[PDB]
PDB file of C-alpha atoms and ligand atoms in Angstrom:
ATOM      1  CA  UNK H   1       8.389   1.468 -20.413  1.00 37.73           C
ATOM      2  CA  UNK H   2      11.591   3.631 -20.295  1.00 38.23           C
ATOM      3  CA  UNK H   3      11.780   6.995 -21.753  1.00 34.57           C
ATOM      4  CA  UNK H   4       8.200   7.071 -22.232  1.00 37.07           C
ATOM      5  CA  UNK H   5       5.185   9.128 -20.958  1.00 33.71           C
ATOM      6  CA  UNK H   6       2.101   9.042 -19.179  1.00 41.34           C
ATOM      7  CA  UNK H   7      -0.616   8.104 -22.049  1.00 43.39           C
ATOM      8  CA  UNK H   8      -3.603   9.274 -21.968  1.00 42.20           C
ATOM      9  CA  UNK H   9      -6.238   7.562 -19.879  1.00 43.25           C
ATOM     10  CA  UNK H  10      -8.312   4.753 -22.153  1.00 47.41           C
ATOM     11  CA  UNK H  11      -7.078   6.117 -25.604  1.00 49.57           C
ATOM     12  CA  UNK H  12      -5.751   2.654 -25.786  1.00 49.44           C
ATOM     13  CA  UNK H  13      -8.851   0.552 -24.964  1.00 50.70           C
ATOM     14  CA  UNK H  14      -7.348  -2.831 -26.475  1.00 51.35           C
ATOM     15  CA  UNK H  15      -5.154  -2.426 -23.782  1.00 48.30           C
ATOM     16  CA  UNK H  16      -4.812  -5.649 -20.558  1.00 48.39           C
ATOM     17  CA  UNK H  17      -3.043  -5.642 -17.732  1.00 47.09           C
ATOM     18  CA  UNK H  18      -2.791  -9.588 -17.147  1.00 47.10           C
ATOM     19  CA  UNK H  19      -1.927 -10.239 -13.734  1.00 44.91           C
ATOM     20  CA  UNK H  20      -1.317 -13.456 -11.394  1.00 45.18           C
ATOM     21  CA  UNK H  21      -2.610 -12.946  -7.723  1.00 47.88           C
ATOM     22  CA  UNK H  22      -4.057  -9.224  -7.984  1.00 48.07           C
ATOM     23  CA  UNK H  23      -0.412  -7.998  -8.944  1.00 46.18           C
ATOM     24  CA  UNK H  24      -0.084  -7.381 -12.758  1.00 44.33           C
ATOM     25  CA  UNK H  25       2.400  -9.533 -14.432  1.00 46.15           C
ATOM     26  CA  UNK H  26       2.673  -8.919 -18.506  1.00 42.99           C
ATOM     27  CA  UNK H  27       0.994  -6.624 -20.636  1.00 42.07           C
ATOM     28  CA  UNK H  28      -1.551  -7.914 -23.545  1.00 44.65           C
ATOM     29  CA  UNK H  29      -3.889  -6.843 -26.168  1.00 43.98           C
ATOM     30  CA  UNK H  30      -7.486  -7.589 -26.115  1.00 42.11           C
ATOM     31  CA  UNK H  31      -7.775  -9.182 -30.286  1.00 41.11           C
ATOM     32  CA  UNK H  32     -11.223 -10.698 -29.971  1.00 42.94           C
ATOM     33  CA  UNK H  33     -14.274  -9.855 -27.362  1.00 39.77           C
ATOM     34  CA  UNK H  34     -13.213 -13.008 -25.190  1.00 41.51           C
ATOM     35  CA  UNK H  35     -10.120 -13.116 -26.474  1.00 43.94           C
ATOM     36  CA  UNK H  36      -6.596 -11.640 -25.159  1.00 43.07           C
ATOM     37  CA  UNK H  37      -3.148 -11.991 -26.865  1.00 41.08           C
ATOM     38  CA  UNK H  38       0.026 -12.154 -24.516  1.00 41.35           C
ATOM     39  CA  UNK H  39       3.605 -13.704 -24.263  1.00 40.13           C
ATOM     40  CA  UNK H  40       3.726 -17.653 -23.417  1.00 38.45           C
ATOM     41  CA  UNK H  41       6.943 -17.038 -21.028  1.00 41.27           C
ATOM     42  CA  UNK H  42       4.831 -14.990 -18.757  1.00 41.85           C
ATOM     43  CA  UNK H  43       2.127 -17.319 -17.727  1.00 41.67           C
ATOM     44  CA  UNK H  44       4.986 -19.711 -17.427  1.00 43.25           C
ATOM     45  CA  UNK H  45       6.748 -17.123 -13.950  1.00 44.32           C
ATOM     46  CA  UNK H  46       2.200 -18.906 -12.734  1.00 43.87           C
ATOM     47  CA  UNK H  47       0.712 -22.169 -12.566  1.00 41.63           C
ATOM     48  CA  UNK H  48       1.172 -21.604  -9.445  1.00 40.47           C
ATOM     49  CA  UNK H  49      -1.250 -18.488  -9.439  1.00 40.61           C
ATOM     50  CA  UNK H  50      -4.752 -17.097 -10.234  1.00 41.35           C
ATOM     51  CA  UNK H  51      -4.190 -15.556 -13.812  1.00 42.17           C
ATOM     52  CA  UNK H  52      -7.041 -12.821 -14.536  1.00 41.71           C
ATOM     53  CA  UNK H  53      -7.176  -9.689 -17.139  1.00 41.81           C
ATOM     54  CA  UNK H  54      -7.565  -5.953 -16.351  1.00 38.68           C
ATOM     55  CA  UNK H  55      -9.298  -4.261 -18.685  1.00 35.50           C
ATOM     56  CA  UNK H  56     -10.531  -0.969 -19.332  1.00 35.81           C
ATOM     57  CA  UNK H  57      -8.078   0.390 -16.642  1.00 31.02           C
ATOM     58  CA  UNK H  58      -6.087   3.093 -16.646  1.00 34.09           C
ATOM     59  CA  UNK H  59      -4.690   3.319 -12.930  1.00 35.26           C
ATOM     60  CA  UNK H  60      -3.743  -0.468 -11.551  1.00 36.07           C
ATOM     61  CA  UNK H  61      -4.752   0.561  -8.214  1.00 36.41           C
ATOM     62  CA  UNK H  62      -7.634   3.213  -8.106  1.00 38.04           C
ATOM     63  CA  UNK H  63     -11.132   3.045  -9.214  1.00 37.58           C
ATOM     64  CA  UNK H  64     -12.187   3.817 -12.917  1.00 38.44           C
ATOM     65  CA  UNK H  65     -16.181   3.107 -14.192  1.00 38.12           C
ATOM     66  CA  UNK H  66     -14.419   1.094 -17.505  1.00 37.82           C
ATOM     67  CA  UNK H  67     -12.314  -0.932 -15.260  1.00 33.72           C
ATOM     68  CA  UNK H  68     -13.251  -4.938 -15.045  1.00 35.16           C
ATOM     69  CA  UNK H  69     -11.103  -7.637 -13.693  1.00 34.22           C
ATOM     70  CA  UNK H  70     -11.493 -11.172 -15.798  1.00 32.24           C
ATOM     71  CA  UNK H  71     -11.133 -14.472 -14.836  1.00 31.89           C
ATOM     72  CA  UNK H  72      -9.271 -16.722 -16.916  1.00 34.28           C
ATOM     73  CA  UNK H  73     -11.941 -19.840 -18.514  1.00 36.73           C
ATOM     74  CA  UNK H  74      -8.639 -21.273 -20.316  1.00 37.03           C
ATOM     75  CA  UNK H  75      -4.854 -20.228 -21.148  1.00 37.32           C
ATOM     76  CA  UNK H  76      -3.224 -21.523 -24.833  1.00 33.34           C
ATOM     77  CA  UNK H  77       0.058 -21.602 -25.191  1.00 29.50           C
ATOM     78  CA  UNK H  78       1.641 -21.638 -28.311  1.00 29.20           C
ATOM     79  CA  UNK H  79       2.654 -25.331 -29.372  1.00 25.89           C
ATOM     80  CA  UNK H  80       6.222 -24.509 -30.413  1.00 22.86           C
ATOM     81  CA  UNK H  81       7.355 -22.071 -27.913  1.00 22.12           C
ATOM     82  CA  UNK H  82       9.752 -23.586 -25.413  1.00 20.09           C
ATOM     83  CA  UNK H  83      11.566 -22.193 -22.183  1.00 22.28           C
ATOM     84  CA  UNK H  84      14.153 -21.571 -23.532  1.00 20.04           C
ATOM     85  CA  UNK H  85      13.976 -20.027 -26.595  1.00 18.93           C
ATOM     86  CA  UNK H  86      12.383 -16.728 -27.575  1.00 20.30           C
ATOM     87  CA  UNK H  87      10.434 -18.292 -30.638  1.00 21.85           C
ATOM     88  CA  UNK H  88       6.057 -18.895 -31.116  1.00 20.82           C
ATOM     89  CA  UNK H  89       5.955 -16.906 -27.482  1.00 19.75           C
ATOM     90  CA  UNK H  90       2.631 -16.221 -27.748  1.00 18.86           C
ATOM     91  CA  UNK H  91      -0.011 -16.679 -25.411  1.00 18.92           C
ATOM     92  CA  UNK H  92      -4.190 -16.392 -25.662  1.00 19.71           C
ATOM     93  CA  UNK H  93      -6.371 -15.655 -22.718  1.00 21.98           C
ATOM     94  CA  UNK H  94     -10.062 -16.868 -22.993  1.00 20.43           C
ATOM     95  CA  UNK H  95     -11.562 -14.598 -20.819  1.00 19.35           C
ATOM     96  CA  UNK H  96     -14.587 -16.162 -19.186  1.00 18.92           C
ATOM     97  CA  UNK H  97     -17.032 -14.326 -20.922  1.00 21.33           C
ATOM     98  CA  UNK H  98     -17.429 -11.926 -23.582  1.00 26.67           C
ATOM     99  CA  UNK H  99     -15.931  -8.668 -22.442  1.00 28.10           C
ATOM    100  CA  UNK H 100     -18.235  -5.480 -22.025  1.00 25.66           C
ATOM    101  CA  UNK H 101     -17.120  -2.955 -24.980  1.00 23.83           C
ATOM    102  CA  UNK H 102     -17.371   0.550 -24.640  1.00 25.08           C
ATOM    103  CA  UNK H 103     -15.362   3.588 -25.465  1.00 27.84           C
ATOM    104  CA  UNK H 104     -12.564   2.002 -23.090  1.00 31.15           C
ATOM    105  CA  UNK H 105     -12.855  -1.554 -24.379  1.00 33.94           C
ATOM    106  CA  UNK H 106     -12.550  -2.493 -27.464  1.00 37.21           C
ATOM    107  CA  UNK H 107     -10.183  -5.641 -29.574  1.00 38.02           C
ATOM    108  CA  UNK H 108      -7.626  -3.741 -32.040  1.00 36.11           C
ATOM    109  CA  UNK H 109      -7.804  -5.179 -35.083  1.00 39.44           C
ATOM    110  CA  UNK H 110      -4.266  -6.839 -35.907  1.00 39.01           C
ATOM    111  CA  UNK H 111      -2.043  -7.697 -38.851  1.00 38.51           C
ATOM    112  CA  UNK H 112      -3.417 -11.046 -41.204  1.00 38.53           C
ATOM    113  CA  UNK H 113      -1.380 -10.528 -43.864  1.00 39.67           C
ATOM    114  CA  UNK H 114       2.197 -11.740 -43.964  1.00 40.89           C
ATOM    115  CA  UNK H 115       4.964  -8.473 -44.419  1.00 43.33           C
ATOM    116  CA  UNK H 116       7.321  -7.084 -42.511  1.00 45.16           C
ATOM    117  CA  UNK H 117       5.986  -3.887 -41.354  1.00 42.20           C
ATOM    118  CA  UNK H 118       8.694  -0.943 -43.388  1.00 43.96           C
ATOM    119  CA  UNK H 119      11.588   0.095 -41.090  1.00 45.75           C
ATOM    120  CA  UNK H 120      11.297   3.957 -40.043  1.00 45.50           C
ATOM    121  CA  UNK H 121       7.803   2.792 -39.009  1.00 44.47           C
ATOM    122  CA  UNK H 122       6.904   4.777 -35.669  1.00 44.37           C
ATOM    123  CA  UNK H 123       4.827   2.346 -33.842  1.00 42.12           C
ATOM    124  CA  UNK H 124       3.208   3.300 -30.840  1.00 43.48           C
ATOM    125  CA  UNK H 125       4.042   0.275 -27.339  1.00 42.74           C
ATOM    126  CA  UNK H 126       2.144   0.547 -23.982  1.00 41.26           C
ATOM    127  CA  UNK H 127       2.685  -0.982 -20.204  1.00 44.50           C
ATOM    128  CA  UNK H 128       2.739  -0.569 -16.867  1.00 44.80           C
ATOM    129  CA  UNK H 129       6.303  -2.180 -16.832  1.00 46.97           C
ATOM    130  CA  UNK H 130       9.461  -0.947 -15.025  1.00 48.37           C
ATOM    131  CA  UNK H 131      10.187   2.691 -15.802  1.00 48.87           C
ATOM    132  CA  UNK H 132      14.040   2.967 -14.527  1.00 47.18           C
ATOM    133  CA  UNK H 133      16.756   0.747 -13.782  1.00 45.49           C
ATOM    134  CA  UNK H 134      15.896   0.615  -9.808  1.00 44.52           C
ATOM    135  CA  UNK H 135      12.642  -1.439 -11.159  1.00 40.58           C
ATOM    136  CA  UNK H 136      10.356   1.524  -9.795  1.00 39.27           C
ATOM    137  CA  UNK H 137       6.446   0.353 -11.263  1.00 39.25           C
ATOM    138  CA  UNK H 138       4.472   2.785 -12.472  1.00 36.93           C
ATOM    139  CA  UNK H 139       0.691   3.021 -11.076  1.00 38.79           C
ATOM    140  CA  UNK H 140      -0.642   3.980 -14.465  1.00 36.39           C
ATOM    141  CA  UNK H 141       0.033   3.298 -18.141  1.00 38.94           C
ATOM    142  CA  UNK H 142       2.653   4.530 -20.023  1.00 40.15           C
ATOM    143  CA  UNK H 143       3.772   4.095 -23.308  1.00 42.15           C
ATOM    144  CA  UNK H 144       6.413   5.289 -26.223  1.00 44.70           C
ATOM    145  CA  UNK H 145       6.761   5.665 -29.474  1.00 45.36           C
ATOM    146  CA  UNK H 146       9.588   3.527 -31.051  1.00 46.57           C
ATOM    147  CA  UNK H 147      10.574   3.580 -35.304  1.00 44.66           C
ATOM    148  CA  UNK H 148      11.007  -0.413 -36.530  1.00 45.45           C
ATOM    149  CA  UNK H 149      14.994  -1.528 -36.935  1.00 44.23           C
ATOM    150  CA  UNK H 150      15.577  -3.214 -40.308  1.00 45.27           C
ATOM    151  CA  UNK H 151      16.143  -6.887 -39.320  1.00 43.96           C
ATOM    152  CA  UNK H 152      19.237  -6.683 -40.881  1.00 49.11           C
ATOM    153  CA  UNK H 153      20.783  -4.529 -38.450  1.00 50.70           C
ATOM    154  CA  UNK H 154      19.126  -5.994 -35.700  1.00 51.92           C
ATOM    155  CA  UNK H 155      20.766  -9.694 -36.547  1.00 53.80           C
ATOM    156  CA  UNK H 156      24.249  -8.111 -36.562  1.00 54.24           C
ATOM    157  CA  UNK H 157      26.883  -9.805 -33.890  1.00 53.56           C
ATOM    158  CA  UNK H 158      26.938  -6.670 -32.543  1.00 57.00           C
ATOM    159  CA  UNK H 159      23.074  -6.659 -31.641  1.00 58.72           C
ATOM    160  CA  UNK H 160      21.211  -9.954 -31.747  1.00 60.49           C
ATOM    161  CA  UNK H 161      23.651 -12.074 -33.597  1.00 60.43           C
ATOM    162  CA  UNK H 162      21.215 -14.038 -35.961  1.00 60.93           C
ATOM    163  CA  UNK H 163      18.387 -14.134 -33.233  1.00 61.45           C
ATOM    164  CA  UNK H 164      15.713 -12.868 -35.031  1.00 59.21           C
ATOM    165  CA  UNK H 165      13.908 -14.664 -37.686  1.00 62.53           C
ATOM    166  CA  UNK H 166      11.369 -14.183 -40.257  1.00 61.08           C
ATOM    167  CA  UNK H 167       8.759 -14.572 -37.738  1.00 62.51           C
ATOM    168  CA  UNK H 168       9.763 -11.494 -35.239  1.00 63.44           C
ATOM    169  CA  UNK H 169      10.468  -8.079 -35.363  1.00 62.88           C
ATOM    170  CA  UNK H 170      12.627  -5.312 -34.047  1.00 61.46           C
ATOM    171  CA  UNK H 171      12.325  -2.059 -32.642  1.00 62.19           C
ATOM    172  CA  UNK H 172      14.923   0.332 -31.884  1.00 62.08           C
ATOM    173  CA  UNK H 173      15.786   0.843 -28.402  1.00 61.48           C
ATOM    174  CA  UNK H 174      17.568   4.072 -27.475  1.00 65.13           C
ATOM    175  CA  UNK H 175      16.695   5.028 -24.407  1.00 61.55           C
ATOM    176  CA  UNK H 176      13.317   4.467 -25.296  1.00 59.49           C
ATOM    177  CA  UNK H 177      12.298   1.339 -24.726  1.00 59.14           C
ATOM    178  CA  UNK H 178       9.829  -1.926 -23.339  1.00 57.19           C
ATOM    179  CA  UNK H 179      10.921  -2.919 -20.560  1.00 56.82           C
ATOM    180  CA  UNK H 180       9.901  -5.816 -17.464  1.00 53.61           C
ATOM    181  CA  UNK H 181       6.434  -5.833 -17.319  1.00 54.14           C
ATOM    182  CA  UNK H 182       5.603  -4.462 -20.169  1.00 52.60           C
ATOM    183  CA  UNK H 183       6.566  -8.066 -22.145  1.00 53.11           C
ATOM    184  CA  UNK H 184       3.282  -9.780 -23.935  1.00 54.74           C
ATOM    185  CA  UNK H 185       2.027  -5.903 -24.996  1.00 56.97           C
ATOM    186  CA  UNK H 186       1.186  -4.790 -27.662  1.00 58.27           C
ATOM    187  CA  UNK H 187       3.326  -3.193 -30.536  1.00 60.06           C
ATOM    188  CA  UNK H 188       0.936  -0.769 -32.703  1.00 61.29           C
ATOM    189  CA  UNK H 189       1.544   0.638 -36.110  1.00 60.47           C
ATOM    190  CA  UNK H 190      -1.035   2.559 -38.108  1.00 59.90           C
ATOM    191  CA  UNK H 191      -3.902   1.288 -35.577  1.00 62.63           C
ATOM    192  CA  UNK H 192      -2.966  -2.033 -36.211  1.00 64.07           C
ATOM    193  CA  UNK H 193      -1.602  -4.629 -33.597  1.00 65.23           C
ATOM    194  CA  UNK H 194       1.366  -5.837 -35.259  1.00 63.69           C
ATOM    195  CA  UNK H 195       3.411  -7.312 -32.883  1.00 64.10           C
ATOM    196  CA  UNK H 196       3.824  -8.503 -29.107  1.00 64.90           C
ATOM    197  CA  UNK H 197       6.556  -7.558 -27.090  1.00 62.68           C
ATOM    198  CA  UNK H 198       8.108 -10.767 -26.098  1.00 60.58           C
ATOM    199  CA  UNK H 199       8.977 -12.100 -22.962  1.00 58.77           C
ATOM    200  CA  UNK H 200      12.840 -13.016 -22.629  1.00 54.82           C
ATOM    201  CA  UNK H 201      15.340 -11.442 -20.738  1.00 57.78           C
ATOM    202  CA  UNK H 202      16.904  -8.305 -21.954  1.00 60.41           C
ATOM    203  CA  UNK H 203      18.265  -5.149 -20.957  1.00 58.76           C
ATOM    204  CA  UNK H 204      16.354  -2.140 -22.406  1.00 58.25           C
ATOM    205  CA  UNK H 205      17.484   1.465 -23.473  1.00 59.53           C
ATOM    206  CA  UNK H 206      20.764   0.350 -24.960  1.00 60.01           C
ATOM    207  CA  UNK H 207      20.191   0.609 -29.069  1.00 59.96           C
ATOM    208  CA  UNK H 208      23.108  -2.040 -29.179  1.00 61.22           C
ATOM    209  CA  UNK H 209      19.872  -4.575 -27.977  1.00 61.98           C
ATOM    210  CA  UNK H 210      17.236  -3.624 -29.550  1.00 59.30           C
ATOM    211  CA  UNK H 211      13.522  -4.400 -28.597  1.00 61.71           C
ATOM    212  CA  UNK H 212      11.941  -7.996 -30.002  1.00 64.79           C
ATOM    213  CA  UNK H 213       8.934  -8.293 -30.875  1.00 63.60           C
ATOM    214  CA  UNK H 214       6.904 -11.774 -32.070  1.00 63.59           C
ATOM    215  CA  UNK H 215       4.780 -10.411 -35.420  1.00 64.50           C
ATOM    216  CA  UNK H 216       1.555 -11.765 -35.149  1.00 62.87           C
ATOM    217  CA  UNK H 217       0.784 -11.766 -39.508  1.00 59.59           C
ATOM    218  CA  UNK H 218       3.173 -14.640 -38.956  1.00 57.06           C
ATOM    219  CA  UNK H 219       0.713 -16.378 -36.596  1.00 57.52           C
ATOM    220  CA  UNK H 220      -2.039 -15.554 -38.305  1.00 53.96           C
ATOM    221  CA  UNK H 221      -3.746 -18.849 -38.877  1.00 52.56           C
ATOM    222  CA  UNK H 222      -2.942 -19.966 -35.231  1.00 51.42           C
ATOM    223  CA  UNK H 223      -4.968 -17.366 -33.597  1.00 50.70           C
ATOM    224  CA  UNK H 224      -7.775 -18.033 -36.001  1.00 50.15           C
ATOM    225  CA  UNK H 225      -7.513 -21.650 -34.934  1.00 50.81           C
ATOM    226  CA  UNK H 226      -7.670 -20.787 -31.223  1.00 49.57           C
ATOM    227  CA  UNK H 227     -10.193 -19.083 -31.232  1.00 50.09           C
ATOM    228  CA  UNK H 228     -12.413 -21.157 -33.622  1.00 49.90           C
TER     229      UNK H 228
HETATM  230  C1  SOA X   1       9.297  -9.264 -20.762  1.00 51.83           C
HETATM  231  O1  SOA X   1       8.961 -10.447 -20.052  1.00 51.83           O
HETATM  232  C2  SOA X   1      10.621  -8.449 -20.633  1.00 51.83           C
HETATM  233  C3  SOA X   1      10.834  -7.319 -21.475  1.00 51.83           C
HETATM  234  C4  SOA X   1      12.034  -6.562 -21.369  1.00 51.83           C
HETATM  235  C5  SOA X   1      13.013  -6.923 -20.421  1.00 51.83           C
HETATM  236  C6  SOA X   1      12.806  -8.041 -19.574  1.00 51.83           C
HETATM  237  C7  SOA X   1      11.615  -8.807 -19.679  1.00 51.83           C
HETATM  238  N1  SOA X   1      11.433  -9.876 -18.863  1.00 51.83           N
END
């Protein structure tokens, strides 16, 4: 997250760190009690790693009483999403069992029903991704709070030139913005998960690029058939 803040420890308890070999990788959002929701390009940088879920964590490194690390039972990939293309990047994480709920654990509940979420909306995005441009990682969570960009203005040649469809979402991004590691988050408005940061490329604090996000509403049914 750049231009962000500190946020405060487990006020976000949907919140996952999901990490490949102890070292987290992507952010995600904990929709279900086995269930977490993340970008399909990350999991794509493994394969060749042991993918788990932090939960309940505040601090990556030090100990916390909420904190659990999950194994991974199976990873789902959205169908349609492809390498190269920034389209169906979703991702779900069954966690290998049922997570533990408490006051630092708990699934947000997220958007079913398909519209755009108003621009002007000031929606609320967490990580533990890159806070500056040398890469520095922060040890604990951060997040920002970032107003929705009318697609309109975010499809402009100027910005993303036609790159974002019905099925995503923008956020502006001056100065404030996601960042590396903070791709396959989550992107809350009115304490509802409605989108996921997604997980291509892009330079972050310049409002001429402004922040993507996949809108989950417009996956709606998928989910639900995932986790059937
Ligand atoms: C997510 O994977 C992301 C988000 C912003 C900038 C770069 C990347 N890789």
């Amino acid at each position: 997250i750049l231009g962000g803040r500190e946020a405060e420890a487990h006020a976000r308890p949907y919140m996952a760190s999901v990490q490949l070999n102890g070292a987290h990788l992507c952010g995600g959002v904990l929709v279900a009690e086995q269930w977490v929701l993340s970008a399909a390009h990350c999991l794509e940088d493994a394969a060749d790693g042991k993918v788990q879920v932090l939960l309940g964590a505040h601090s990556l490194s030090q100990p916390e009483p909420s904190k659990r690390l999950y194994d991974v039972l199976r990873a789902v990939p959205h169908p349609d999403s492809q390498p190269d293309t920034i389209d169906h990047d979703l991702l779900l994480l069954q966690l290998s069992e049922k997570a533990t709920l408490g006051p630092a654990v708990r699934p947000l509940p997220w958007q079913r029903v398909d519209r755009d979420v108003a621009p002007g909306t000031l929606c609320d995005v967490a990580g533990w991704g890159i806070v500056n441009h040398a890469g520095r990682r922060p040890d604990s969570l951060q997040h920002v709070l970032l107003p929705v960009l009318d697609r309109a203005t975010c499809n402009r040649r100027t910005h993303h030139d036609g790159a974002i469809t019905e099925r995503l979402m923008c956020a502006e991004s001056n100065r404030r913005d996601s960042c590396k590691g903070d791709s396959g988050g989550p992107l809350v408005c009115g304490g509802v998960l409605e989108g996921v940061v997604t997980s291509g490329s892009r330079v972050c604090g310049n409002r001429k690029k402004p922040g993507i996000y996949t809108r989950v509403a417009s996956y709606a049914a998928w989910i639900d058939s995932v986790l059937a």
